[PDB]
Amino acid sequence: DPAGLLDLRQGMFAQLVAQNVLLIDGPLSWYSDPGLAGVSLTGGLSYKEDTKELVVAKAGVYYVFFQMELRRVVAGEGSGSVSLALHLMPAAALALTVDLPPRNSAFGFQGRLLHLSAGQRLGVHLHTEARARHAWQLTQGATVLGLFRVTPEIPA
Amino acid sequence: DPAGLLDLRQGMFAQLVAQNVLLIDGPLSWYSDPGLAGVSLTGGLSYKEDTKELVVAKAGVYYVFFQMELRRVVAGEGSGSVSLALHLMPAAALALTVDLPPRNSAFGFQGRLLHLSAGQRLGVHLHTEARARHAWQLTQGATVLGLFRVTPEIPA
Amino acid sequence: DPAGLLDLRQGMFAQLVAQNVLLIDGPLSWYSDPGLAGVSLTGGLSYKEDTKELVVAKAGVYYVFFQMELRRVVAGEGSGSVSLALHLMPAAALALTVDLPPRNSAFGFQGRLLHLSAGQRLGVHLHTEARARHAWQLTQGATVLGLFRVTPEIPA
């Protein structure tokens, strides 16, 4: 199973940083950075090993957010939009679109409450087009997926 | 006074579990489970003693949520909706409705910020109809009322 | 630099209490009260020294809220609305309006997620009109500006 495991108790928080910098269509690759607050990814992944798939171990409602920072690396060029979408695997649960000015930075954040069943597999896909992809990149280390568990277990 | 007391400091959290399993119209009965995170109910109630009335001791804004899980216990039967509504005692402050498929589970969550005055009495009423009530039940221990205090006292 | 400094780590919280009681148009004056939860204002301000300007040291998304409590001090008089608006210095990021009955109390709360860049200067302006200003006041110590940092730094 290539996925990392997120096992959160109520009131506990985890965040994942995207390895990607190029705006390439498809699943982002995530890792846990122990220098950041929160619980680490589990299920057999090594220290800072990145994965495109995540499994949420506990059923619950989670506040889930995306943050994305972009920057224009090719002077005088690029425009369009860049989107992220969280997909339940195997419509988007949570989506974030950020517009790029033809300022040389762009930023977006979006979160929401999501119900996630035990064992729920998750992926995040990025989409943009050629004009943006050829001139802009993700700022390194600033694309983050956050999860906060709101709800409890059933009493023993 | 039959009510349990919720005395929360800023930044502190309490949750109550519903004793009910039958979908009967009227006030739900709540207790604090010490095996769950958060502050316990106070004001003279015994260990896991349930109550239909709650009094919030401190004036403030609280994030308040309901969670409800239901399950079809009579094979091949039941449909409709089930509602919860928080009432200020003695319009609903917070309401949650969940639709039941004619899957054998249903789930809902709703929260919101509420201003609650010192001493504010609270009850939660459940409503549904015969068809749902005769075939579905609350999953045991998964109906929860959560309160999180956002705001502070006046400085001394 | 007359501003107080807010230097918050991820997951950390700070709140400021307004010194003002009169409903006078213009910037409110804020101080940190160590008797309240959260991180203190920094940047050279003394113990409970109040300031009209705040600088947020770390770039991030913050949940920011205003709370305001008002009370009718002149019996049988006053009506209108009172507004607060957070301004990025040097449209309003966050705004709260509270209506005053011609009950002798009024209350409002509003919060929202805001993206704040490193070094972002902030002020809060109050507005009302003569009729309200001549009969109502801010309850002392109950006007609060809260900030909670949601997002992380870039990994080292």
**Which DSSP string do the residues of chain A spell out, in sequence order?**
--PEEE---TT-EEEEEE---B--SEE--EE--TTSSSPPPBSSPPTT--BS-EEE-S-EEEEEEEEEEEEE-STT---EEEEEEEEEE---SEEEEEEE----EEEEEEEEEEEE-TTEEEEEEEE--HHHHTTEEEPTT--EEEEEE-SPPPP-
Between the alpha carbon of residue C95 and those of residues A85, A147, B23, C9, C108, the distances in Å are 30, 28, 42, 25, 11
3-class SS at B5? strand
CA distance C100 to chain B (A): 17
* Cβ pair A155:B36 closer than 8 A: yes
By C-alpha distance, which of C19, C96, C111, C17 is closest to C64?
C111
Contact criterion met (CB below 8 Å) for B124 and B87: yes
Contact criterion met (CB below 8 Å) for B93 and B42: no
CATH match of B1-156 with 2.60.120.40: yes
d(C-alpha C61, C-alpha C56), whole Å: 11
Q: Looking at the complex, does the CB of residue B139 fall below 8 Å from at least one CB of chain A?
A: yes
Backbone φ and ψ for A42, nearest 5 degrees, come out as -130, -165
d(C-alpha C115, C-alpha C57), whole Å: 13
Contact criterion met (CB below 8 Å) for A139 and A54: no
- The three-point CA angle C56-C60-C62 to 5° equals 80
| Token duo for residue C42 | 């920094």
Contact criterion met (CB below 8 Å) for A63 and A147: yes
- Amino acid code (one letter) for B82: V
The secondary structure of A118-129 as a DSSP string is: TTEEEEEEEE--
d(C-alpha A28, C-alpha A84), whole Å: 9
- Best to test chain A binding among B99, B144, B145, B148 (most A CBs inside 10 Å): B144
Q: Which residue of chain C comes nearest to A139, CA vs CA?
A: C154
Q: Give the rounded distance of the alpha carbon of C4 from its chain centre.
A: 13
Residues with Cβ within 8 Å of residue A145, at least 6 apart in sequence? A15, A16, A18, A30, A64, A65, A66, A86, A124
Q: Looking at the complex, does the CB of residue B15 fall below 8 Å from at least one CB of chain A?
A: yes
d(C-alpha C10, C-alpha B77), whole Å: 49
| Token duo for residue A30 | 């995530």
d(C-alpha C141, C-alpha C32), whole Å: 11
* Residue B70, beta-bridge partner list: B106, B138
By C-alpha distance, which of A125, A60, A122 is closest to A90?
A122
Contact criterion met (CB below 8 Å) for B96 and B156: no
Q: Looking at the complex, does the CB of residue C15 fall below 8 Å from at least one CB of chain B?
A: yes
Q: Which residue of chain A comes nearest to C156, CA vs CA?
A: A35
Spell out which residues of chain A touch residue C150, defining contact as CB-CB under 8 Å: 65, 109, 111, 146
Beta strand B26-27 with B144-149 is: unpaired
**How long, in residues, is chain C?**
156
Residues with Cβ within 8 Å of residue A71, at least 6 apart in sequence? A104, A105, A106, A136, A137, A139
Contact criterion met (CB below 8 Å) for A98 and A139: no
Method: X-ray
d(C-alpha C2, C-alpha B141), whole Å: 54
| Token duo for residue A27 | 């699943």
- To the nearest 5 percent, what fractions of chain B are helix, strand and coil? 5, 50, 45
d(C-alpha C74, C-alpha C82), whole Å: 16
Contact criterion met (CB below 8 Å) for A81 and A16: no
CA within 13 Å, CB half, A69: 19
Longest dimension (CA), chain A: 61
Contact criterion met (CB below 8 Å) for C94 and C111: yes
- Amino acid code (one letter) for A63: Y
Q: What is the resolution of this structure in A?
A: 2.3
Q: Looking at the complex, does the CB of residue C67 fall below 8 Å from at least one CB of chain B?
A: yes
* Cβ pair B156:C15 closer than 8 A: no
| Token duo for residue C34 | 């160590």
d(C-alpha A53, C-alpha B94), whole Å: 36
3-class SS at B46? coil
Q: Which helix (H) or strand (E) holds B117?
A: none
Buried residues in C21-39 as b, exposed as e (16+ CB within 10 A): eebeeebbbbbbbeebebb
Q: Give the rounded distance of the alpha carbon of B81 from its chain centre.
A: 17
Q: Taking the C-alpha atoms of B132, B136, B139 and B143 in order, what is their torsion angle to the nearest 10 degrees?
A: 10
Query: What is the residue extent of each domain of chain A?
Result: 1-156
d(C-alpha C35, C-alpha C60), whole Å: 27
d(C-alpha B108, C-alpha B69), whole Å: 7
d(C-alpha B122, C-alpha B55), whole Å: 6
By C-alpha distance, which of A9, A109, A96, A4 is closest to A54?
A4
d(C-alpha A52, C-alpha B28), whole Å: 43
Question: What is the DSSP code (8-state) at residue C149?
Answer: E
By C-alpha distance, which of B128, B148, B7, B142 is closest to B64?
B148
Residues with Cβ within 8 Å of residue C91, at least 6 apart in sequence? none
Pick from A9, A61, A155: CB nearest B17: A155
Sign of the four-CA dihedral C94, C97, C103, C105:
positive
Contact criterion met (CB below 8 Å) for A83 and A97: yes
3-class SS at B129? coil
Pick from B36, B107, B111: CB nearest A152: B36
d(C-alpha B29, C-alpha C45), whole Å: 51
d(C-alpha A115, C-alpha B142), whole Å: 14
- The three-point CA angle C5-C12-A147 to 5° equals 135
By C-alpha distance, which of A56, A109, A123 is closest to C150?
A109
Q: Which helix (H) or strand (E) holds B148?
A: strand B144-149
| Token duo for residue C138 | 């801010």
Contact criterion met (CB below 8 Å) for B4 and B121: no
Residues with Cβ within 8 Å of residue C97, at least 6 apart in sequence? C81, C82, C83, C84, C108
Backbone φ and ψ for B42, nearest 5 degrees, come out as -130, -165
Pick from A109, A111, A144: CB nearest C152: A144
Q: Looking at the complex, does the CB of residue B137 fall below 8 Å from at least one CB of chain A?
A: no
d(C-alpha B54, C-alpha B72), whole Å: 30
Q: Looking at the complex, does the CB of residue C21 fall below 8 Å from at least one CB of chain B?
A: no
Q: What is the CA radius of gyration of chain A?
A: 16
Beta-strand ranges (E) seen in C7-156 are 13-18, 26-27, 30-31, 54-56, 60-72, 80-89, 94-100, 105-116, 120-127, 136-138, 144-149
Sign of the four-CA dihedral C97, B91, B50, B2:
positive
- Amino acid code (one letter) for B95: A
d(C-alpha A16, C-alpha B30), whole Å: 37
